[model samples]
Target: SNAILATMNVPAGPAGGQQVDLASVLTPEIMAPILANADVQERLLPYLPSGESLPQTADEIQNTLTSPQFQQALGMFSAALASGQLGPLMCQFGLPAEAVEAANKGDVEAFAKAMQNNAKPEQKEGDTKDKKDEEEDMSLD
Candidate 1:
């Protein structure tokens, strides 16, 4: 199988980063816990490419995760997300102002850091609130 490598370059960020391979990052082990959640399945299932022969549930998740089409889409998304144009778009989803600001800077690391900061409160809820649920709710696009 051919490899898909995606590079994210931030010329002005505080720290430098390197290339990321989606296959490396989303291996079966990494996706196991995520795929186990029913909420995640519901959120992602509809977006997956449908076919008569495709399997359902976690199997489908893994299949699509490793598919070239999804990899290409993800690569495109990495570029679109870091273009600084989605900064204002973050507000529409009610992300913390800090995250939106970080997104405006077009720094994925900063944006993720800011979002993680905002996650502390939800994390405190533990069993009462699934962090994945909160994240999925925000994907209302």
Candidate 2:
């Protein structure tokens, strides 16, 4: 029952902006709706190791929403991004060019903003086109 993640700082952009906490910005409430979306599930399920089942139902979704594993994953993600270790890694996922640039700066706020701006129609469809079947999608590493 320790805290899920370390307190990490997202650096401001070049324009004298403020720092942000990516995890705080992405609470269970904020992420729940997005994660509940069928389309979103399709995109992210691959990254999760499945033991019982995929969260397709409301109760199932909520269970996973409150699960420690999910919390730990996202927590680690926040720490990694804040650590600046993830800067060069975003490009491999074919993230937004601006996201890549922002990451290059090791500016998490900039990266987050860039990701928001870059989440246009194409990236939604483009990065999420992993057409794996339901069973195969859970075959995560």
Candidate 3:
């Protein structure tokens, strides 16, 4: 909702560049595959904002994705990442050298590019699988 998005106050990076729009970057379509996975849903349930009535399912995951509270947090994270403050941390995480270079320069776009390039689902060995469920599996460490 606009109300929740309004609460987001992403500060400019040290480089004085505008923050990337999280919503635009992470659209529903972009997240659909991951949200639809049962394993992913289970792994994510514990991380969702705690509440009296928590539903551990795709619907709940979709709700969280659309929630402004989560968006605000994501915005803050993006700002922090783009500010170059997380460069060394990214290195600690063993991110690609390209991504680390981008983070060190406070370049969100470049960082995203490098990360995505590194994240492309690799060709794994498989056969007789009816060619279904081919979407690459994304995991968090």
Candidate 4:
């Protein structure tokens, strides 16, 4: 049988893995609050779509959040990352073991959970170093 991925010509869409759609998790309802949050907004504002005149207010942020172009980009991002090709890229970000495992398995929900676990504020510097050390140990098995 012919496969959809066979024709996509994307960098490395998975030939065999669950289709990990971002909308399954990151709905507008979920994003509205995050978008309004100062910290998240600050972290993400730089990445928003650019143009001659972009909006920076709450309404504008919401509009941009629901924009088709942005949504499509998120969908594309979800597909590419969950295709198992982002495993090496995830390593470059120094993600933890759990996220790396999810990335390798192409399990979007688990990977999202692991990614959300990234910004812990209380980990000692030594612990961070230890975790980074552990992150370096990805066996191809």
Top candidate (TM-score): 3
Steric clash pairs (candidate 1): none
lDDT of 2 by residue, 83-111 (tens): 55545666766677887677567566777
| lDDT on C-alpha atoms for all candidate structures | 0.46, 0.50, 0.50, 0.48
Which candidate model has the greater lDDT, 2 or 4? 2
Q: Cα RMSDs of all predictions?
A: 16.1, 16.8, 14.6, 14.7
Per-residue lDDT tens digits of candidate 1, residues 53-134? 2223556656664655445433332333466644665665666688678657766566656665774355564456534555
Q: Per-residue CA lDDT of candidate 3, range 59-102, in tens?
A: 66467656564454344334555656556555655567897788
What order do candidates take by TM-score, descending?
A: 3, 4, 2, 1
Candidate 3 segments exceeding 4 Å error: 1-67, 123-141
Q: How accurate is candidate 4 locally (lDDT)?
A: 0.48
Clashes of each: 0, 0, 0, 0
TM-scores for every predicted model: 0.38, 0.39, 0.42, 0.41
